[PDB]
Amino acid sequence: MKITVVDLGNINVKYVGENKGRFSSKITNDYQSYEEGFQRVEYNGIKTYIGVGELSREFNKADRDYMAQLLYSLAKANTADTKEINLTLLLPIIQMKNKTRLIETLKGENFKFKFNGIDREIKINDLMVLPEGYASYYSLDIENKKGDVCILDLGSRTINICVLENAKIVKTNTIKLGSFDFYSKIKSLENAKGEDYIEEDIQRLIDNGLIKVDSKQYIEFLSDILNAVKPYVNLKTYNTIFTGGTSLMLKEYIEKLPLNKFKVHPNALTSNVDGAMEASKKVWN
Amino acid sequence: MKITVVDLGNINVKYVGENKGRFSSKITNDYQSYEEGFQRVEYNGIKTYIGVGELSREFNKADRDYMAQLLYSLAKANTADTKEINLTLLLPIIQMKNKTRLIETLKGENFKFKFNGIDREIKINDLMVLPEGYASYYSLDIENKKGDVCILDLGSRTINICVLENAKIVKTNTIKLGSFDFYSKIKSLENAKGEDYIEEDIQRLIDNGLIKVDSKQYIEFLSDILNAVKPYVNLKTYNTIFTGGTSLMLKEYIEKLPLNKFKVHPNALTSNVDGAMEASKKVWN
Amino acid sequence: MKITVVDLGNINVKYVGENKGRFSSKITNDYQSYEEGFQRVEYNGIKTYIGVGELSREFNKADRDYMAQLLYSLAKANTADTKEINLTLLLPIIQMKNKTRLIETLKGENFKFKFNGIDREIKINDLMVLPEGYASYYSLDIENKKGDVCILDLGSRTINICVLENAKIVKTNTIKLGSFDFYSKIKSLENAKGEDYIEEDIQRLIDNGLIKVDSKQYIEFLSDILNAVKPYVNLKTYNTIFTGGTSLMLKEYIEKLPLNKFKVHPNALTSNVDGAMEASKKVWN
Amino acid sequence: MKITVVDLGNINVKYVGENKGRFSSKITNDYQSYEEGFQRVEYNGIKTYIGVGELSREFNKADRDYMAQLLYSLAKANTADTKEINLTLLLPIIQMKNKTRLIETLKGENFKFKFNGIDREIKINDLMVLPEGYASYYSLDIENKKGDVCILDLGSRTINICVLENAKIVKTNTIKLGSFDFYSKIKSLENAKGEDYIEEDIQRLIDNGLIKVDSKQYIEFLSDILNAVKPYVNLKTYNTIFTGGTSLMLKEYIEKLPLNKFKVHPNALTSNVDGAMEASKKVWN
Amino acid sequence: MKITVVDLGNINVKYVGENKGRFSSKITNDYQSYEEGFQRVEYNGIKTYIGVGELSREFNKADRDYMAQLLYSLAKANTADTKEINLTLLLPIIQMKNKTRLIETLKGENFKFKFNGIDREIKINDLMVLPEGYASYYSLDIENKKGDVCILDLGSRTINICVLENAKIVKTNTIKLGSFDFYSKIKSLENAKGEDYIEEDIQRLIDNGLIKVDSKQYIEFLSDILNAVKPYVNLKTYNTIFTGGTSLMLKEYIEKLPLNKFKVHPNALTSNVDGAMEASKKVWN
Ligand SMILES: Nc1nc2c(ncn2[C@@H]2O[C@H](COP(=O)(O)OP(=O)(O)OP(=O)(O)O)[C@@H](O)[C@H]2O)c(=O)[nH]1
Ligand SMILES: Nc1nc2c(ncn2[C@@H]2O[C@H](COP(=O)(O)OP(=O)(O)OP(=O)(O)O)[C@@H](O)[C@H]2O)c(=O)[nH]1
Ligand SMILES: Nc1nc2c(ncn2[C@@H]2O[C@H](COP(=O)(O)OP(=O)(O)OP(=O)(O)O)[C@@H](O)[C@H]2O)c(=O)[nH]1
Ligand SMILES: Nc1nc2c(ncn2[C@@H]2O[C@H](COP(=O)(O)OP(=O)(O)OP(=O)(O)O)[C@@H](O)[C@H]2O)c(=O)[nH]1
Ligand SMILES: Nc1nc2c(ncn2[C@@H]2O[C@H](COP(=O)(O)OP(=O)(O)OP(=O)(O)O)[C@@H](O)[C@H]2O)c(=O)[nH]1
């Protein structure tokens, strides 16, 4: 019956199933006093509280206590009393160097937890994993897949690039770059003011406008990434579909690019799962 | 029907219900001669007289004979012949490590007393507890909750800090510091004069002016607390709402701070209960 | 209509009503020959003669045949043909451990007597009792009650201490010490001369100067009492109002004290009743 | 040469030196007629008679005319013609807030008296003070000090608690509770019979059996104290050595407790001084 | 002249200088009555008592009142009248994110204190800081540094890992894991018995044997940590030198491991400072 996609993302984690949505990738298993005021889950001796704590730009998100979080995300797309579901997962392209163990450490198994006191264990019917960013391919319609295209997922730490022909990949790339390197470059001198701010809290302070950043620096980042991608791809060729949340940093300037064929996908951040679902049906149905 | 908040505070206890107000947290069950000249209550073998005696900076205010006092406070916000009320209580953030027992030692139970000869037992409809200092959150209007803020309760022994985003907490802290450590630092040398005075009676002697204290020492305390809070919070960020009575020590200098967005809440001392009441309705109504 | 205060004092008893004054607390129901030359009253089989006899420093002045005396005192403040009056009484702080019975043994009752042949019984409208020494509080004006003060009744056997804030008590104490312990300490060696004199007749012999006492011994007593009171009160704080007759032993040296704010109340001996009357009106009016 | 411990206790005072023993803590300097029939001592204008009078549950036993008594106790452990001895004293844990003055008001000084006409002044070689209740520690043998223990002095007004590891303290506590609060709770209704009896004379009437008390009320007191001590100590841990005279109220039920390791020390009342003596040697020898 | 290493450790703090040793990291500036019975120091308004109180697993040990403690530790390795010494300090690897301020808040400065009344201020000649755990490197002899090795400091909250080639680091890691997570996992169900015990007091109760723990659970913890470390290091490679006190939890099973080359360093707990001293000489000499 039931199908689910959980995408682990860069800044957020992502659930779609009986319910849809996402939430922050931040994790705390560090100090904890007010159990009742925070989302919480305990499993196999790991007690974690969801959407707050430490994130520290680390690799191995698929091994460092994300389990709880992942389970939580599945509970988000699922009901509070679920026991069996079929699983589509995703990981960024490069990180797939860790697929195997994960799969057999999860495949068709049941896992416990305490979350918020609901405290139930859930079995999974089957796991099938896709490259994060790539799955947007299937969300594409033949309106552009009939021609060569470029799935271009601007994630906050990353840019994942899938250069595709009609009904097939042509090339792939991924460079750990994105809005964080911009935040850090901006902080290299804005924090040198004598101010205590970081790339982690920066986006909030621009959201409220307590501090602001020049647009031409956004343009500098755009130019840098364009220069980086030139050797592999001719962006004018391979009509480019921008996905991920970092595309929403810059849609305003991306639309201003001199390129011939491109577009920031509506709900660009969530498009990849939208295609991962075409794939999900193609397996289960 | 009826709702009540009793906040146990640092120096005072706090009642709001059929009646509103507060009174000193001082307790005597030590010598007692003139029963008629003091507020008095006896319950379960504990005879206590209200607003005078020993306070001694002790933890466990929620276990050391405060019962009588607490009951008294409820009688203050209530009529003299009450028998059933619904209870919202509060405790400082850290002290919640003692919630559980208290709740089930009180939940939906009836308790006796002798107070001043009125000598009635009263049932409670339900208890629901909030972190003291945090509840000011709800007293906030969207005029500032729409932006990230910092509930900053300067209590006499404590500073409780709740760093909040729009409609949610971001971080929390609490350091047992306040006007008492200032009194003690001042007494470390002013009492070294060869004078018999203490942090307990000091505030009275400055109220009458029998002895006075330099303002720059208030500024030293302000600088010390600001240095203490720096690692967690950027005070310029998270527009700071000062609450509690110790904020009334220093409003005159707090307004002089170089911060961008801040304010000493009107009735800052009582704001936390004012929000605890938004919460009270959100449960009962 | 009518109000009366009878204060039982240490050495004297005290009447104010239709008439004002006081007289010695000495009692004789021991030998009696010349009925006509002494004040006399018989009631309920107790025949007593007023202002002479035995006093012997005994407690329970409110149970040992003072009745006659008390009645006499009421007759002093009253007319010789009185039948109904409203009663304010007073007892020293500690002695209130005996209030209850007295009250209901007197409340709203009529009592007979023979005094000097006038031999009438009188009803009392109501009794209301105050701590002797404390009532001086009400005789105070806002000129000093606006600040923290100390009602300090030096009675001959006692020092009663009421430490007050604005419009309320802060602490209380009472130590059975006074000019008698000075007389006894002086007699411990002056009577050791081989001389037949006692603390009872001593004050007369210094009044006529037949024997005299060094002032520095008065100062020794002052220093001793000051050392005794130190743990409870900072005399420089709580502006001290001296009351009672033993304050008139030492006014000359009390004015010489190094204290910041103090005063021997004019008519210090009678001030306590002067305030007991503010209280009397506050009940009856 | 000579060593002495005088322990001031709750109900009794305690002397060990050239002689050993104890006697009641009751004091009278109030009326006195038959000098010859009572133990008596006069010093510095204070005339007192030993083991009878007023006790009134008051703090400051180390300032309120105990001097005479204390001297008497030293005379008890000493000969009738002593002039120089070395002093170990003790006070309850909390009361040590008064150490300093006492020490320098006594240290290496000579003090007079009249006692019973022996009327000699005695010098003291040195004072060294220990927490009453704690000194039982040293009376312990390595048979249990090798393991963590709990010196548990049940004094009549108090329970003093010293939680110790091997050769060191771990925690301490003291709550003014004991057999008096039981007497008062029992009197709250047994005296409400319409009977004239008090906690002061109660123990005698149960000693002669003129009135008796249910054992289950002893058990109620035991349960109350056990509930009180739970937050600090796990009684099963820290093998508990009961000391003081109130432990002799209940040894019969203490032995019935479900605890794993505990014992009422033989001569439990006097054990603390027995250890204070190990300490005494460790100073003098 | 003089050199000192103070290592702040996980459970203890560590001093070597004119004197050597360590003591508990526990801190109390909370209630304090018996000043004389506890180690004590006051500096800049902070009064602290050493080796007892609150520890609460908190970060920022290098900012939360450890100053006093740190000073105390220096006094431990130093004489009681020291005024100038050269400083080598250490902090855990991760915590170095706080180096800078500490250094310049201490570098070449003089600091006061009251400790136990010795109450002297001491200057420091220079500070130089090393990663705790890493310094064991220098304590190594060429007998194993000639080959690739792994400094493996099992601290109670932590495992610090320094993977080294000949005369140089190859990689580093640190995971906040250790005997505490074992205590907490054991308490998750052993305290669920209905028993009042915690990870803080657990080790004592196993030291005295009042409660005991299965060895296979130690083996479970060992297996968990080994699984955790696999991605970074091949333990068979990089001959592993176990250091810290948590290595002394398990030496008995560590020796049983199937590894080819490893050893629990003699005085494993103190080895890191032993190498920090090779470094100390390499600076000063
Ligand atoms: N301006 C704007 N930025 C957004 C929005 N949603 C997400 N983002 C940005 O997305 C960035 C986070 O990384 P992403 O670009 O989303 O990369 P990702 O792999 O999709 O990571 P996930 O968000 O977890 O799916 C942050 O810089 C966000 O500010 C949005 O609605 N508006
Ligand atoms: N100057 C001034 N200080 C006040 C006033 N009201 C309360 N305070 C101060 O408040 C301090 C007591 O602790 P609080 O700051 O009130 O902390 P709290 O947790 O709110 O404790 P509670 O007063 O019981 O609610 C004392 O130092 C008081 O002087 C006021 O109206 N004026
Ligand atoms: N020198 C002097 N002493 C007075 C005078 N009036 C009363 N006394 C003293 O008062 C002492 C008696 O005890 P009080 O001090 O009056 O104590 P009290 O509780 O007020 O007792 P009462 O006199 O009955 O009201 C005696 O030592 C008197 O000498 C006075 O006018 N001059
Ligand atoms: N049943 C019984 N009770 C005793 C005995 N000796 C002392 N007590 C009790 O001890 C209580 C008095 O207080 P304690 O428990 O002795 O406390 P303390 O601090 O040791 O006071 P001291 O007796 O002066 O040393 C009273 O309730 C006595 O009844 C005894 O031999 N038998
Ligand atoms: N069994 C045993 N354990 C020890 C010994 N010494 C220290 N420990 C353990 O060490 C642990 C505390 O943390 P450590 O492993 O020492 O970590 P650390 O960073 O070295 O902290 P410090 O002890 O302060 O140096 C506790 O679990 C102790 O039981 C010992 O001699 N025997």
Author numbering:
A (entry chain E), B (entry chain C), C (entry chain A), D (entry chain B), E (entry chain D): 1 to 285
Lines quoted from the article behind this entry:
ParMs generally exist on low-copy number plasmids where they contribute to plasmid segregation and stable inheritance. Here we report the discovery and characterization of two chromosome-encoded ParMs (cParMs) from the genomes of Desulfitobacterium hafniense (Dh-cParM1) and Clostridium botulinum (Cb-cParM). Both cParMs form filaments, exhibit nucleotide hydrolysis, and possess characteristic ParM subunit structures.
The 2D classification images of Cb-cParM polymerized with GTP appeared to show a mixture of two states. One state was similar to Cb-cParM polymerized with ATP, and the other was distinct. We tried polymerization with GTP for a shorter incubation time (1 min), which yielded the latter of the mixed states. The averaged images from the short incubation time, showed a more uniform diameter along each filament. Two maps were reconstructed from the second condition (GTP, 30 min), corresponding to the two groups in the 2D classification, class 1 and class 2, and one map from the short GTP incubation (1 min). The maps from class 2 with GTP (30 min) and the third condition (GTP, 1 min) were similar to each other, although the resolution was limited, suggesting that they were in the state before the phosphate release. The nucleotide-binding cleft was slightly more open in the models for class 2 with GTP and short incubation time with GTP, relative to the GDP state. The intra-strand interactions between subunits were very similar in the three models, except for a slight shift in the position of the adjacent subunit in the GDP state. The GTP (30 min) class 2 state and GTP (1 min) are equivalent in their inter-strand orientations and have fewer cross-strand contacts than observed in the GDP state, suggesting stabilization of the filament bound to GDP. Thus, there are two dramatically different Cb-cParM filament conformations: one comprised of loosely associated strands (likely to be bound to GTP or GDP-Pi); and the second formed by a closer association of the strands bound to GDP.
